[PDB]
Amino acid sequence: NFAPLGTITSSSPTAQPAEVLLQATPPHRRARSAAWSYIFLPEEAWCDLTIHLPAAVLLKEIHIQPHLASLATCPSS
Amino acid sequence: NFAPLGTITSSSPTAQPAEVLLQATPPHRRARSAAWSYIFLPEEAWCDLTIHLPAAVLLKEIHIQPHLASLATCPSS
């Protein structure tokens, strides 16, 4: 897992910092709050997150874990 | 709402009774257990529920409310 060594950023100027998404140890699977949250404007359809790595890597898999306490907030695609 | 006056049944001989789904007052939004549950066999794809009414009615709408405490169990279609 190379994610903890990189830097995460977003193009929305009003987004909560998301450096907590890269921690190696996953949060508890019964937490009452999502680690990272994003609020959509009524005319918005997509949000973006960019991860920069310090050096080139042969990539094979991407893992994303949503907030299990409430799956109504899982991204649609 | 004509549902409370009808009878509900299912074609699976090993299904939990589902007469509680017809109650007029909805359960609490923060309940820790689903009102009705069904367990799928590994070769099963669909389950069925039939509601019989005592007299003919001009039907317009159908409402179904899943278990909000865990949306991973919401039916796919």
Three-class DSSP labels, B1-66: CCHHHCEEEECCCCCCCCHHHHCCCCCCCCCCCCCCCCCCCCCCCCCCEEEECCCCCCCCCCCCCC
Alpha-carbon distance of B58 to B46, in angstroms, equals: 27
In angstroms, the separation between the Cα of residue B30 and the nearest Cα of chain A is 12
Structure's resolution in angstroms: 3.3
Name residue, tokens 């910092």: A17
Nearest to B1 by CA among B65, B66, B44, B48: B65
Please, what is the Cα angle at B57 between B56 and B58, to 5 degrees?
135
Q: What is the DSSP secondary structure assignment for residue A5, as one 8-state letter? A: G
Q: Which residues of chain B make contact with A68, given a CB cutoff of 8 A?
A: 72
If one counts every other C-beta atom within 10 angstroms of the C-beta of residue A12, the result is: 14
Alpha-carbon distance of B42 to A77, in angstroms, equals: 27
Question: Is some CB atom of chain B closer than 8 A to the CB atom of A65?
Answer: no
Alpha-carbon distance of A38 to A74, in angstroms, equals: 11
